[PDB]
Design a binder for this molecule. Structure first.
Ligand SMILES: C=C(C)[C@]12C[C@@H](C)[C@@]34O[C@](Cc5ccccc5)(O[C@@H]1[C@@H]3C=C(COC(=O)Cc1ccc(O)c(OC)c1)C[C@]1(O)C(=O)C(C)=C[C@@H]41)O2
Ligand SMILES: C=C(C)[C@]12C[C@@H](C)[C@@]34O[C@](Cc5ccccc5)(O[C@@H]1[C@@H]3C=C(COC(=O)Cc1ccc(O)c(OC)c1)C[C@]1(O)C(=O)C(C)=C[C@@H]41)O2
Ligand SMILES: C=C(C)[C@]12C[C@@H](C)[C@@]34O[C@](Cc5ccccc5)(O[C@@H]1[C@@H]3C=C(COC(=O)Cc1ccc(O)c(OC)c1)C[C@]1(O)C(=O)C(C)=C[C@@H]41)O2
Ligand SMILES: C=C(C)[C@]12C[C@@H](C)[C@@]34O[C@](Cc5ccccc5)(O[C@@H]1[C@@H]3C=C(COC(=O)Cc1ccc(O)c(OC)c1)C[C@]1(O)C(=O)C(C)=C[C@@H]41)O2
Lengths: 429, 429, 429, 429
C-alpha cells in the first residue's frame, strides 16, 4: 500500500481498552527496537502515502487512544531518550511540571495535528473529546488567552460594526425609482453612500474568504453542509450582497429583495461568533444541527400536510381565498396560533370544510409538532454532551484560522519554549 | 399435536442466554443424530401442521436467538457437511467471505423467512431487531440496492404524478351545477377530463390493491390497524374516490365533499413512501403509532372537557352563539390559541361565564395538552429505538411487495447464486 | 402494646432482601413451632386491637416481602399441612395449577386484604405493586371479567345516560324570569321536567353516595384530597346540583350559575370511569396527580406574576381598561396566545408600558410555562410507572365497590371451590 | 502558609471513598496523639489564617467526608474522650438518643458551620447536600419549627400587607399634573397618603437591609448574582421606590414609571418566600436559575433573529410600520402567537416579504423556542435533584437571618442543654 508499519498500527486500532493496550505494546516494541537499530533515522517522521505521520493519522481517523498514548510518551532510557514526547521537570506529588514537544502540532509544513483533527471529514468519531487530550487542550487554551482571544473579539466587533453600517445604509436606502441614485451633496447622502461602499466591501471580503476556504478545502456536496456550515452561510450572504450590487447598477429595484436577505443573513451570521463561547454558543451549535439534520424531514412531512389539506380546502371552496396560495397561508396560520378556522363563507358543505380544518389542526397543530418535540427530546437527552464539545472544536477552528491569517508578513506567533530544543511547552498539572 | 420435535424446540425458547445456549445444544444433538441415522432424509424441511418449517417458526414467533443460530450454522464435519447453512470461503483476519444458503429465505413458495417476519402478526416481540441477523440484513440491503430501490423510487414518483394530476383535476373542477358536466371542445377541458379519468383510474387501482391485500392476508378487526395501517389508508382514499365517482354521476354536488377527503388523504398518503428512509421515515412511523396508540385516549378526555364545558357555557348563555356547535368551536379555539375569552355579551352571570372559561382554559390549554406532552416524553424516551428499526421492517415490506409484483411474467429477479447449488449468497463481512 | 408476635414480625420488615429472608425465616420457625405446641389455636387469625391479622397488617403497611410470603406459603408436612395458604395440584414444568385459600382476603368481616390495600391511607409505600402478588392479581382479574366488568360498564353507561338527560334538560331550560316555571301540557315541557327530575335524582343519589363514602371512611382534611379525589368530585357535583334546586325553587335565576358547574363537573366526572382502563385511564390519573400536586405551586407563582404586573399596568394607565379586572384579563390573554401587547392607548410612558408587558410576556409566556413543562418532564420520566399501577388500584376499588353494593339482598357472588374447604381458588400459572 | 496540619488535612480531601477513609484516618490518629501529648491545650479551636477552624474549613470548601466525620466523631478512649463531638445516652435497637455539641455550630464569633455553609461563595460543590448531615439537618429543622417558622410566616405576612398597602396606594394614585399633590381633608386622601408613607417606609427599610447585606457580605461582580440574587432584587425594588419618591417631589410625572416597576418588582419579590417551602419553592429556585443562567444565551440569539429579520423587513417596506420599532413589535408578536404574517401592504415584493416572515417564523417560532425547550429538557432531567436541596439551603439562610435579627436585645433563641456542658443537643434517631 506504500505505508510503514506504524501507520498500520494506527489503522488497526478501534479505541477499545484491549485494543488500546495492545497497540501501545506494539508501538513500544517497535520504537525501542528501531532506536537500537537505526539511531540515525527517525521513524515517526515518516509519512504515509497521503503525507501524514502516524500521529496525524491517529488524529485524522479519530483514534483517541493511540493519539493519547503518542502525545503522552516519556522515554528516559539510554539511547532512547531522544525519542521522548514529554519529560517532567518537577516531580511534586499532586502536581507535575510536565513538558511537551510541539513538533508537527502547529508547524508541520505538510499536515499538523491541529490541522487534521480540526479540519477532519466530520466522520472522525472522537473529534469532540479528542481535543481533551492534555497537551492539545492546553495549547488551545494558551493560544486562546494569549493572543487569539483579543483578535477574535476584535473580529467579532468589526463584524458588528460592519453589520451596523450595513443595516444603517440599508434602512436609509433611497426610495426613488430606478437605481443607481445620484449622490446629493448633503452629508446624509455622503454617509449613506459611504455606508453602502463599506457594506459592499464587506460583502466582497466575505465572498473572497469563502472562495479561499472552498478552494483550499475542496469539500464535497455530500458533506458540504455537515462541515463548513458557517462558511457557506457567510459565503451566501456575500453572494446576495453582490447580486444586490449587480441589480443596483442594473437599474432594477429588485436589488432590495437581494440586499435584505443578505441583511438578514448578515445579522444571523453573528451567531457564528457565539460559537466558541461555551456559555452562549450552544444555541448556534444546536441551530446548525437542527437545521441540517432535523428540518428537512419535519418540513417535508409538514408540507405534505399543509399542501394536502390546502388543496383539499381550496378545491372545496368556490365563488378572495380561491387561490391555492391564500389557502396555504390561511392553513399555515394555524401553525402560528392565528388560524381562524372559519375564514371563508364562500364555499359549500360547512361540515366538510370544518372537518377538514379540524383534521388539519389535529394532525399538525397537535400531532406533528408534538412529535417534533418528542424526537428532539430523546435526541437532546442523548447529544447535549456532544454539542458541549463541538463548541471547543469550533474554538480550535477559530484559533487555527487566527494563526493562518495573522496579517503581519511574519511568523512570530509562537506559543512557548525558552529553554533548550524543539519548542517545548510546559504544563503544570 | 401433529408437530415434530424440531418445532417444539423452537416453541420452548424465550430468547434468554441460558435458554439460547440450551436450545442450540439440543439442535446440535439432533442434527448430528439425524445425519448419522437418516442421511437420505432432510430434517429442516419437515413442516409442522401449519406447513411451517422450524426456521420459519423461529422467525414467526420472534425467537431471535434460535433464528440467529440457524441462519448462522456451519457444519464442516465428516458425513454432516451437507446439513450446513453457511460456509466460510476466505478466512482473512478482520473479514470473512461467508456463503449462505437462501433455501426458503426469499424463495419458498409457501412462506419464506422474510415473509413470516415481515408479515408477522405484529405481536412478534423481536421483528424489529430480527432483521439485524446478518444474512437477512444483507439480503435486504442487496436486493434494495440491486433492483428494488429504483422501482420503489419509480413507484413513489408515479404516485407523485398521480397526485399532481389528481390535484390539478380537482382544483380546476367545473363549478356548474348538477354533475356530470359536458366536455367542452376546448383543450383545457380535455386535459381536465383526462386528469379526472386518470384520477379515478388511480383510485380504482388502489382499491383493487387494497382488496388483494386484505384477501391475501385476512386480517382481523382486533388487529386490523395495529398492522396493515398504510394499506387501510390507501384503501380508504380509494373508497372516497369511488364514492366521489358515484356521486359525480349520480347528479350530486356532494361528490366534491368526497373527492377532497381522497385528495387530502392522497397527499397525506405520500408519507407511506417516507417510511423506509431511515432519516425521513421517523415522522411517518410516529404518526402511525401516535394516531393508533395515543390519539384515542387524549381525544376522549379532550372531548369530555370540550363538550362538558361547552354544554356549561351554552346553557349559561341565552338571548348567535346560542347553539351548542358554535360554542363548541369557540371553546375549541382556545386550543389553537385563538380563544377570545369574552366572545359573547348575550348571557348572564359574567363571573360564572368567565370562571367557566378560565377553568376550561386551565384544564385543557395548560393542563391537558402539557400532560400529553409529558406522556409522550416518557414514551419516546423509551421507543425511539423501536421506530429506528421499524424503518427496516417497512423496507422489507417494500422489497417483498416488489418481488411479488414485478410485472414481467418471469421469475428472473433472483439475488444471487450460480455455483455449486442452492442459490449461494456471498457476504464479505 | 396489645398485639401478638406476628404483628411485630410484620412491623419490623422494610422490604429489603436480607430483611425479607430473615422475616420469612422467623415466620417459618414460629409457625411450625406454634403448630407443634398449640394445634387447636391458629396464630395468624390473632388480631390486633384494630382487628387486623398479620396478613392484613403486612398488606396495610405496604410490606411486599411478608405478604408475598404469606399468600404464597405451601406447607405439606405432617401436623403442619393444616396451616398452609396454598397447595399445588398439577406440577407441570412451565405452569403450576396452584390452589389458594381466600380466608380474610375477600371475606373477613373485619378487614380483608383487598379492603386494607385498596382503602389504605395512601402513605402505604407499595400499594402500587402490591396487587401484582399472584393471588390478588388473579382474584381481581377473575372478579373483573366474571361479573364486575359488565356491571361497571352498565354503571358507566347509566352515568352517561344521566349526563345526557341532565345536559338535555339544562340546555333546554326555560328562559323566563323567576323560577320555578309552570309546565304547559305540551310534551316538550313534560320531557324537560322529567329530565330535571331525573337530573336532580342523580344529584341526590350521588350526594348520598358521597355521604356514605365519607361516613364509612372518615378521611382527614390533611389527606382528604390525596386520596378519595373522585368521590369528592362527585360529591361536589351533587352539592352544586342541590344548590341549583334550592335556588330554582327560591325564585332566583342564579340556579343556572350553580347548575352549569354541576353540568361541567358532571361531564368531567366521566373521566372517573376511564380509570380502570389501562388504555385510556392514564389521563384521568395524570390529571388527578397534576391538579392535586402540581397546580397549586404553578398557579401561586403565575398569579403572583399576573397580579403583580397587572397592578403595574393598571397603575400606569389612566383616563375602559382602567379596572384591575380588565387588565388582569388582558394580561391573561398573553398566556393563551391572544395578548394584544398594545391594548390601550389611554396611558402615558409607552416605553414603560411596553417594557412591562415584554417583561411580563418573557417571564410567564416564555419562561414560566416552559419551566412547568421542564418540571413535569423530569417528574413524568420518573412516575409513568406509578400511574400505570394507580390504574390497578382504581380497578381494585371498582371491584370492591361493586361487590359491596350488589343490590340483591343476597351474598351469592362467590367464585369457586366446591370440594374439601375454605373457598379454594385455582390459578394456572 | 501559617496553618496547622489539620487545615491541610481538610484541604487535601476530595470526597472520594479512598480519600475519605485516608483523611479520616490521619485526622483521627493525629487528634488522638495530640490529645495524649497536650491534654491541656485544645487543637480544633486552632484557626487558619482566615480565622476558620478545621471544621469550618471542611464546611467552607464543600468537603462532606471530613465534615460528616467531624460532626459524627465519638471518642471513648481514656484521656481522649473529652474531645468527642457526640455521645450516646440510650442504646435502643433501631434508634439512638445521640447527644451532640454545638460549639462553633451556631455560636463561634468568627465563623460558624451554618455561617460558612449558608454564606459560602457558591462554588462550594456540596453546600446543597451538606446540610443533610444529620446534626445540621436536625438543628435547622428544630430551629425552624421552634421559633423561626412563625417569625418567617409573620415577616412574609407583613410583606404581603406591605404589598397590599403599596398596591392600593399606587392604584389610587392621584391623576393631577405636577406632583406632589395637596391632601384634601377627606379620609380617602388620608388613607392614600398614609399608604404612600408606609409604601416608602417599606422601600427605605428594604434599601437599608440591602445595604447592610452587601456591606456584610462584600460580594464581587463576577458572582454578585450567582449568590445573593434575592437580596439584589429586593434592593432594586427599593431603589425604584426611592427614585419614585425623588421624582414625586421633583415635580415630575415620571415617578409613576418608577413606582410601577417597584410595584411589579415588589409583587414578584413575593416569590422569595416560596423558597424554603419544598412544596412551592421549587418554582422560585428554577426561575432564579433560568434567568441567571439560561435567559442570557436565548435572548442574545433571539434578539439576533428578531433584530436581523426586523431590519430586513423594515428595509423592504416603504411608503405606519415604517419604523424599526413597529416592525420589531410586529415580528415579536409571532413569538406570542399573534403574528399577523401579512401586517402591511405598503411595500414591494410580496414574495420577498412573505419569504422573510416565513423564514423568521420557522427560525424562531418553531425552531428556536422548541430547542430552548430541548436544552432545558436535558438540563432539568439532570438538575431537579439539586434544586430540591437548594430549597433547604435557602431555608438555612432564612434561619440564620432570623437568628441574627431577633429584635429583642437578648439571645433567648437557644435550643437545649441545661446540664453538664457545651449546649448539649439531643437527636433521637
Ligand atoms: C444554507 C443554510 C442551510 C441556510 C442558508 C439560509 C438560506 C438560511 O436558510 C437555511 C435553510 C432555512 C430556510 C428558511 C428557514 C429556516 C432554514 O438555513 C440556513 C440559513 C438559516 C439561518 C439560520 O442559521 C444560522 O444563521 C445559525 C448559525 C448557527 C451556527 C453558525 O456557525 C452560523 O454561521 C453563520 C449560523 C438564517 C438564514 O440565513 C436567514 O436568515 C435566511 C433569510 C435564510 C436562512 O439555509
Ligand atoms: C384509518 C386511519 C386511522 C385514519 C384514516 C383517515 C380518516 C385519517 O383519519 C384518521 C383518524 C384521524 C381523524 C382526524 C384527525 C386525525 C386522525 O387517521 C387516519 C388518517 C390520518 C391521516 C394521518 O395519518 C397518515 O396518514 C400518515 C401516515 C403515516 C404512515 C403511513 O404508513 C401512512 O400510509 C398512508 C400514512 C390523515 C387523514 O387520512 C386525512 O388526511 C383525513 C382528512 C383524515 C385522516 O383515520
Ligand atoms: C376538588 C377538586 C380539586 C376540583 C373540583 C372542581 C372545582 C374542579 O376544580 C378543581 C380545581 C381546579 C379549578 C379550576 C381549574 C382547574 C382545577 O379541580 C377539581 C375539579 C377539576 C376538574 C378536573 O378534574 C377532573 O375532573 C378529572 C378527574 C380525574 C380522575 C378522577 O377520578 C375524577 O373523578 C371525577 C375526575 C374539573 C372541574 O370539576 C370542573 O369542571 C369545574 C368547573 C372546576 C373543576 O377542584
Ligand atoms: C436583577 C434581576 C436579574 C432582574 C431584576 C428585574 C429587572 C427583573 O428583571 C430581571 C431580568 C429580566 C428582565 C426582563 C424579563 C425577564 C428578566 O430579572 C430579574 C427580575 C425578574 C423578575 C423575576 O425574577 C424573580 O424575581 C423571581 C424570584 C425568584 C427567586 C427569588 O429568591 C426572588 O427574590 C425576590 C425572586 C421580575 C422583575 O423584577 C420584574 O418584575 C421587572 C419589571 C423586571 C424583572 O433582572
Amino acid at each position: 500500500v506504500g505505508n510503514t508499519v506504524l501507520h498500520a498500527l494506527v489503522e488497526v486500532a478501534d479505541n477499545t481498552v484491549d485494543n488500546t493496550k495492545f497497540v501501545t505494546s506494539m508501538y513500544n516494541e517497535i520504537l525501542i527496537l528501531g532506536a537500537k537499530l537505526h539511531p540515525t533515522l527517525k521513524l515517526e517522521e515518516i509519512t504515509n502515502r497521503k503525507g501524514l505521520t502516524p500521529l496525524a493519522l491517529a488524529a485524522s481517523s479519530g483514534k483517541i487512544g493511540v493519539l493519547a498514548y503518542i502525545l503522552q510518551r516519556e522515554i528516559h532510557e539510554p539511547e532512547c531518550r531522544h525519542l521522548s514526547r514529554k519529560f517532567t521537570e518537577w516531580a511534586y506529588g499532586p502536581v507535575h511540571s510536565s513538558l511537551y514537544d510541539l513538533s508537527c502540532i502547529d508547524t508541520c509544513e505538510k499536515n499538523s495535528v491541529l490541522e487534521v483533527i480540526a479540519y477532519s471529514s466530520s466522520e472522525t468519531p472522537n473529534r469532540h473529546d479528542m481535543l481533551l487530550v492534555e497537551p492539545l487542550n492546553r495549547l488551545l487554551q494558551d493560544k486562546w488567552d494569549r493572543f487569539v482571544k483579543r483578535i477574535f473579539y476584535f473580529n467579532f466587533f468589526v463584524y458588528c460594526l460592519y453589520m451596523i453600517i450595513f443595516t444603517a445604509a440599508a434602512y436609509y436606502r433611497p426610495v426613488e425609482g430606478l437605481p443607481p441614485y445620484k449622490l446629493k451633496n448633503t452629508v446624509g447622502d455622503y454617509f449613506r453612500v459611504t455606508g453602502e461602499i463599506l457594506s459592499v466591501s464587506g460583502g466582497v471580503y466575505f465572498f473572497f474568504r469563502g472562495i479561499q476556504y472552498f478552494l483550499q478545502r475542496r469539500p464535497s456536496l455530500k458533506s458540504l453542509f455537515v462541515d463548513s456550515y458557517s462558511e457557506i452561510l457567510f459565503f451566501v450572504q456575500s453572494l446576495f450582497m453582490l447580486v444586490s450590487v449587480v441589480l443596483y447598477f442594473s437599474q432594477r429595484k429588485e436589488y432590495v429583495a437581494s440586499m435584505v436577505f443578505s441583511l438578514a443573513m448578515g445579522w444571523t451570521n453573528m451567531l457564528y461568533y457565539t460559537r466558541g463561547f461555551q456559555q452562549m454558543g450552544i444555541y448556534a451549535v444546536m441551530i446548525e444541527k437542527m437545521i441540517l439534520r432535523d428540518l428537512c424531514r419535519f418540513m417535508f412531512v409538514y408540507l405534505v400536510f399543509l399542501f394536502g389539506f390546502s388543496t383539499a380546502v381550496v378545491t372545496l371552496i368556490e365563488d378572495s381565498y380561491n387561490s391555492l396560495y391564500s389557502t396555504c397561508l390561511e392553513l399555515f396560520k394555524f401553525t402560528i396560533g392565528m388560524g381562524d378556522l372559519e375564514f371563508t363563507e364562500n364555499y359549500d358543505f360547512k361540515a366538510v370544510f370544518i372537518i377538514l380544518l379540524l383534521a388539519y389542526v389535529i394532525l399538525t397543530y397537535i400531532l406533528l409538532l408534538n412529535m417534533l418535540i418528542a424526537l428532539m427530546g430523546e435526541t437532546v437527552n442523548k447529544i447535549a454532551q456532544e454539542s458541549k464539545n463541538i463548541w471547543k472544536l469550533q474554538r480550535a477552528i477559530t484559533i487555527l484560522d487566527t494563526e493562518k491569517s495573522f496579517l503581519k508578513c511574519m511568523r512570530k506567533a509562537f506559543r512557548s519554549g525558552k529553554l533548550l530544543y524543539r519548542w517545548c511547552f510546559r504544563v503544570d498539572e
